[PDB]
């Protein structure tokens, strides 16, 4: 008599190199405006859910591993093409039982070595590399590495206006709905054409079937290493460009120059490599990785309680005996008073309570909101998140994304946990990195 | 020109809707432009280059017949077809020279460079409401209308204050959302836009009227400018006393027991 | 238009019937509109948009010849065919300009926007009865009639109070049951309707007359406005002393013994 | 509950409701929580106020209290399809995790349409009994 | 299920909140006996249905 | 005699619609399906259902 029924239970694994942030509430903004600067005051309270987070910024080793994976995929693609000789062994469409299905690429055949292969294989391998007649060095062609990833948009497919059948659009009985309803929707797709150029277009078409919510992008992934020279004029920064990404002794130093797009591409790539390995059969819908929102970042830094205006225990920049906590410039042209001039090695400075490391300074961090000087008032209190995907035809003003936390270029005013900075979505620089977060599944009673 | 498809999606999401609310009050305020705080609207006393103050932009739109305003009858205010204001009656009453123009549709009436009073407008009426969000249970403010008043010389030296016309907020929302002005006297970067300066509630003023069932203005029950200012402080205690009393965060009673 | 079948079922169930009662008394009251409590009927001093006060709606119905009212003869009141009031005699006596209209049946007589006194009506007569339900044995109140009185200027400055006409409650029940007005001066949502404001007994006033076998009005036995007000307090003690004495809930006598 | 204070003897909240501005998390839980988490009242009912609100079978009218008789009050109206959208509102009583500390008072009225559901309304079932007066 | 006994209660509150504009209201009533659900309808039961 | 016809599936798309500009998408997919919320409260049931 209505005892009730249940469903099979499945667990929530703990991803590697991750820590846990508990629930709570924090006060956003500072109440006393600085007398010198002209910025007026602002304040608003919020609350946020639970979520895991990366201890350290994304190092160089991981980005290099992602680059190698993309290169291997393109190489194996090139191997089986009519121009270079198609090998039927590297691409399989026949099932082991014997049936025909959709093709893919096989990952269980070792790549031939540089000289131990056949001649045509060598000419195929050499297709992606680059050669420079003046200096005689080989490097990964920047423009020939591309990556297409398909993501859905759930939140835009559940609005009351977005439903298909015309009966459910409006619930009032005084306002009827005519059968001929027209709702305009827009998607993104990227088309590779005959000659080998990537063209991206936005199409707007009437809402008929559900394919319209699908999105697909194409973005080059090689880091923008030419940033060092361009950002600083009349300075000898050429020493770092060539070395920063290649030399093996900087593997565990911070990354630099990643634009917003490439950041989303890495965040989306992590999901496939994670899932292809584990199995979660029954009732464990897994949530993909993503860039943190603004509120989650603030809550992570401010240590939870509203008294702390800096991400450490006290309110003084210096420590007990003559040392600096963060890698930031404390004196005019005295970049070297903090110990390090360039971005430094992670895990050098002491951690905060939770367990996060190098929270302020070193490199800044990307964020997934949009920029508007009235940003604080426009979002609801629970899980604030303002999201806007820009279209190509819009002016250049409306595609700025907030960056928060400061870096080694910033003065002691900017390292305050609550201070806003904006940088365009298409250009990277020499003092911005990123880090990844993940929504969790836990039980309230525990 | 026309906005993009995803641009029009952003606008409808941000608009504030007050369809249902279990507490809503209407207050009228008088914003003074000679105090530093409200100086933001009176930065160019005259038209220089592209910099334009608020009143300069308002007169600009109406010359192109792309905007609508209504006359101000004492006491009641309602925006219908009948009360729309014809340009000729408006121009003649306040005393500005005008001449027929050279393009039929580009400009309605030629106006001089300095005949338009841009330095004489000194005080603004702002009509606002405080409402209680049902789905989120937090207080918020919305702006409905804006009316500019000016000052003129008179034989007895009577400093006269006369209103000009009302304005609906929606009609103006798009014209002002892209022009940039500074935000302080000690920092001069054009970071913010006038649209954001109303939204964040950064103006100051004296409460002039409130919706009372007897429909009376404050002055009528106030004898002197001295006694009038005293009434405003207590009213601001009622609105602020509400926001404290609604939430119970911490009392000294529970700790001791 | 026409109500639905199940709509007409709801109405007949809610109507109050006083066919049998072993205690019933009739009291007349004078409701004053200048006190905050009764201000609800005097919210728009003039016609603005759709907001309309009570007297504005009453004059609206009678212009369409869809409503009936009766003249007020001193002392006795009865609603028969003979005492029905013709419009022309009513219009001429109080002094309002009128002109023949343009539609034969849409409007009887053209009325001006402000010629109708909507701000001068200040006091209302309400005729009520208190009755004892037989099947449930609880007290309750029912309203029968409503008459509006107005004030006018005179050479000697005699503030004159003159009634205009009586009204039956049933005839008005359906016209007023859907127009919305606020309920307070410190909250301005249109939650309630005028129909509900009479039912819940939220008006205040001074008792003017009671059904006495000698048929006399209070004033005749009252000398001055000072002495008149004293009589009301004792009458309200009789009605309230009844409701306490009818039920025996708790006395100090039984506990002690 | 027994007393007239929201807080308990030593710094805990009885109900799952928001006690501070944007401080949804001061009560322990943000979303609707697990049943049987908080203490019961005298009778034996659980989670009586807060968590999710509850449906009710009457109709909405601001004069609702005066129109029903004292014994077993019950105003019932089954709406017809042709009637306007105003006349089909049903009362919801008790409040939920979205409500401020004023709404969790046991006697406070809220209305929600009959055709639309939301994120803070549940329900519970009752049953008329047959017992003997002498026992 | 649990059991609720007979009795009488006073409906409404007599002191109107000064801030909000809601006026007062009061009326007494009495009610019969009836069982009731201890907890709200959980997810398991709706899934079974 | 009366007879009705009403769809019974819960209105799980309520979470996103009620709150604008907030990341509530996490609960929609999980609230009714995941086995670890079986004993948590139901949500979105209209009067008819």
Author numbering:
A (entry chain A): 11 to 456
B (entry chain D), C (entry chain E): 25 to 281
D (entry chain B): 322 to 456
E (entry chain B): 28 to 76
F (entry chain B): 224 to 272
What do the study authors state?
The type IX secretion system (T9SS) is a protein secretion machinery unique to the Bacteroidetes-Chlorobi-Fibrobacteres superphylum, which plays crucial roles in bacterial pathogenesis and gliding motility. It is composed of >15 proteins, including the proton-motive force-dependent PorLM motor, the PorKN ring anchored to the outer membrane, and the Sov translocon. Within the trans-envelope complex, PorK and PorN form a ~3 MDa ring structure approximately 50 nm in diameter beneath the outer membrane (OM), bridging the proton-motive force (pmf)-dependent PorLM molecular motor and the translocon Sov, thus representing a crucial component of the secretion machinery.
Here, we present the cryo-electron microscopy (EM) structure of the PorKN ring complex from Porphyromonas gingivalis at 3.2 Å resolution. Using the better-resolved middle portion density, we built atomic-resolution structural models for PorK (residues 11–456) and PorN (residues 25–283). We further fitted the Protein Data Bank (PDB) models into their corresponding adjacent density units, labeled as chains A, B, and C for PorK and chains D, E, and F for PorN, as illustrated in Fig. 2A. The extended N-terminal helix (residues 25−37), disordered in the PorN-only crystal structure, stabilizes within the PorK-PorN complex by fitting into a groove formed by the VR2 region, InsH domain, and VR4 region of an adjacent PorK subunit.
